[PDB]
């Protein structure tokens, strides 16, 4: 009946029990255990009180290693004696030795082959690194095996750059300089990464295409699948990740040219040479990859549960999250999975006493997310014609605890106000904030870089289940979790990310002993969904969108102004974008005034206003999409092409301007820049006009 009862019903012990339940056997996507977990989720959600729980199923292309023929990178002498063999598997965590179906580390969707060649260190395999090798360092990676280090970019971009350079194979490894927090013991006696720990993950470049074999349509039973040779974003060279305990052996013999800069150098006790091949003593020795992993179409299952809306059942508020894991997923994703389970239980125990939400709530335990966001993307593809007209908002719930320091929220500007209000009502679990709101602790620990007194809220990027809903469909999204101290630790992710050591004991001891942080994240997501699907008027504010639009326009304008002579010569102008932003600001002000003054009693008018608020986000979607990326259609927040995961807003103009001084034809590039400016200005003006008077 009240949000306070819902928030008080959530308990940390239930989170602990659900996490324990979900983190005891492997739950890799496409396996039998994942199917059994899906059945358990269905049964428990049915018992909790959900109106209807279903197991949607699809047949998507996954990748598995050959259990008969394990993958391993070797070093071969002149006669190919394989003097050094890499580790076949990482040592199991204590108490999990008898557990079976622990897949060895592998890069999903890597092709086969037995490539031979010399080694070239490429630092983080970024575009800038390859630029430094070829333009400055005079190194031709073509025909050589490329070895990189995890961090600062996505694995897919690493493999794509290595492919463009012409390499034969890719070896990824985790340096202690990026995944070993100082003063922290390894997993058996801490939360740091040991030498055997290997990070997993796909290496695909689907650009939000979902199933590689069915671009644009769901992979149901009556589906036509293209040839793998014609599949979308499939790597063409073998890739296999190792731990630093083996990369040290790979790089100790490395010789040739010196490292370009101390930035390239890591923490391993190796010269970190870049020069192809080993030193003079071992120049004849080469590195041979042994990858025999295969691809196969297998069946994945998403669990979809429905809580029908009392007043507006057609408007769906979705609480997503995925269930597939790599080995045990003590954090990714079973922390979010347990939080979702407890939120569903609280919703059900409120429903069993007569309560019903004003709007329909769709809960979703996705699948095969670690394989390219396949399950959620295919489900959204199947139900796109419904979600585009009925999807109020989407709330993603992936791994909840990243560190015990402070909250972290990534959401659309339409939710910022709501994000603040709920955070003021909740309590802060952090130390030095007993009897204090989560708002003040979040603000002090994470001040906004621009404003003062407001907490920092980052942008919504990609790489999770919100991607299909936000970047293509255009549904307002939001994620909240707990993370590390942003300005101090200075290492990417967490040391045991996507590893066999991501067990339950890790969460229970070194990340959340009392589950108060999990409880707080559960309260945040649950109250967010509650206020989203229960408020009379949708808690959306467009003034925040206007402000951030002006900020993004200024940033892109400065990036363009970096080339004043070129813009003067080709008459590149940004006046249209600024006029569009100003008109958006004025129209948003008028619409907000109308929201403040309107009769809420009349249901038709309230439906009109809430529809306007709903479709404001959808107005930014470009039907044609970004160039070469038809499935990225968000004009403002779509991922960038070149410098993705670090890119700027207005991805079209930003991508057009990227490395524009290296183009052979400046006129064509600046014409493309003008075209993207035109597209952005028209999109902003149209999204503003959707808030104008309705005839």
């Amino acid at each position, epitope marked *: 009946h009240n949000m306070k009862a819902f928030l008080d019903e959530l308990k940390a012990e239930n989170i602990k029990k659900f996490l324990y339940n979900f983190t005891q056997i492997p739950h890799l996507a496409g396996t039998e255990q994942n199917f059994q977990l899906a059945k358990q989720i269905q049964s428990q959600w049915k018992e909790f009180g959900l109106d209807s729980v279903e197991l949607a199923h699809y047949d998507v292309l996954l990748s598995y290693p050959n259990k008969t023929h394990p993958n391993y990178i070797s070093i071969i002498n002149e006669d190919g004696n394989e003097i*050094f063999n890499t580790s076949l598997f990482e040592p199991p965590p204590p108490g999990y030795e008898n557990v079976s179906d622990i897949v060895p580390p592998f890069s999903a969707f890597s092709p086969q082959g037995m490539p031979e060649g010399d080694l070239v260190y490429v630092n983080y395999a970024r575009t800038e690194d390859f630029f430094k090798l070829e333009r400055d360092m005079k190194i031709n990676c073509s025909g050589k095996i490329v070895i990189a280090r995890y961090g600062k970019v996505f694995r897919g971009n690493k493999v794509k750059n290595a492919q463009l350079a012409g390499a034969k194979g890719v070896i990824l490894y985790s340096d202690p300089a990026d995944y070993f927090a100082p003063g922290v013991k390894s997993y058996p006696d801490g939360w740091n990464l040991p030498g055997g720990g290997v990070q997993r993950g796909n290496i695909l470049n689907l650009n939000g295409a979902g199933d590689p074999l069915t671009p644009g349509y769901p992979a149901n039973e009556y589906a036509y699948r293209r040839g793998i040779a014609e599949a979308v974003g499939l790597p063409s060279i073998p890739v296999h990740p190792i731990g630093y305990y083996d990369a040290q052996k790979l790089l100790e013999k490395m010789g040739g040219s010196a490292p370009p800069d101390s930035s390239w150098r890591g923490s391993l006790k190796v010269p970190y040479n870049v020069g192809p091949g080993f030193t003079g003593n071992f120049s004849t020795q080469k590195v041979k990859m042994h990858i025999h992993s295969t691809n196969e179409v297998t069946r994945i299952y998403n669990v979809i549960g429905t809580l029908r809306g009392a007043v507006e059942p057609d408007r769906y508020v979705i609480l997503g999250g995925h269930r597939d894991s790599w080995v045990f997923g003590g954090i990714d994703p079973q922390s979010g999975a347990a939080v979702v389970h407890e939120i569903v239980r609280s919703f059900g125990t409120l429903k069993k006493e007569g309560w019903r939400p004003r709007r329909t709530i769709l809960f979703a335990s996705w699948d095969a997310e670690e394989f390219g966001l396949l399950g959620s993307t295919e489900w959204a593809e199947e139900n796109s014609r419904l979600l585009q007209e009925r999807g109020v908002a989407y709330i993603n719930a992936d791994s909840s605890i990243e560190g015990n320091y402070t909250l972290r929220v990534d959401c659309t500007p339409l939710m910022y106000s709501l994000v603040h209000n709920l955070t003021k009502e909740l309590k802060s679990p952090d130390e030095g904030f007993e009897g204090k709101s989560l708002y003040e602790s979040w603000t002090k620990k994470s001040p906004s870089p621009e404003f003062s007194g407001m907490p920092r809220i980052s942008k919504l990027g990609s790489g999770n289940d919100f991607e299909v809903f936000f970047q293509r469909l255009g549904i307002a999204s939001g994620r909240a979790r707990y993370t590390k101290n942003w300005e101090t630790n200075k290492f990417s992710g967490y040391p045991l990310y996507h590893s066999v050591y991501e067990t339950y004991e890790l969460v229970e001891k070194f990340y959340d002993p009392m589950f108060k942080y999990h409880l707080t994240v559960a309260q945040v997501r649950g109250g967010m969904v509650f206020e989203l699907a229960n408020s009379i008027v949708l808690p959306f504010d467009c003034r925040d969108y206007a402000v951030v639009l002006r900020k993004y326009a200024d940033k892109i304008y400065s990036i363009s102004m970096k080339h004043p002579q070129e813009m003067k010569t080709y008459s590149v102008s940004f006046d249209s974008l600024f006029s569009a932003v100003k008109n958006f600001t004025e129209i948003a002000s008028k619409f907000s005034e109308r929201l403040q003054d309107f009769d809420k009693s009349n249901p038709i008018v309230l439906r009109m206003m809430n529809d306007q608020l709903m479709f404001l986000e959808r107005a930014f979607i470009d039907p044609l999409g970004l160039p070469d990326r038809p499935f990225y259609r968000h004009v403002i927040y779509a991922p960038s092409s070149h410098n993705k995961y670090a890119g700027e807003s207005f991805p079209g103009i930003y991508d057009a301007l990227f490395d524009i001084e290296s183009k052979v034809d400046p006129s064509k590039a600046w014409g493309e820049v003008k075209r993207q400016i035109y597209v952005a200005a028209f999109t902003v003006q149209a999204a503003a006009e959707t808030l104008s008077e309705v005839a």
Partner: nanobody
Amino acid sequence: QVQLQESGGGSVQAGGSLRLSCARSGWPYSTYSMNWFRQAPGKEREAVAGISSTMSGIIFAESKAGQFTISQDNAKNTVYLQMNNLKPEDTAIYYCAARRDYSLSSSSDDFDYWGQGTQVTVS
């Protein structure tokens, strides 16, 4: 306690092949890695080849990599080392060296539990 019982010694003329197999009895730790050290009668102690519980191995004697190979089975908790085309300079004493860390190193100081040793003579 842990006992590295060594066996498989012999005295075969040049060109022969010897098998040096040793078990790992009483090892309580979950993770292990051990190495086959060779000491000449008139020289110091040097590593030859190491293996780990992670099914990773290396031969440090790159000059005679073809002659020497290393294999293990965790079912028997046993490791074998195979000779090819033995030569007179191979006459030496071979020790086991086992340690907790699942790494491979040529340093004899990093190993605490040492094997009995085995004489190998090649004429």
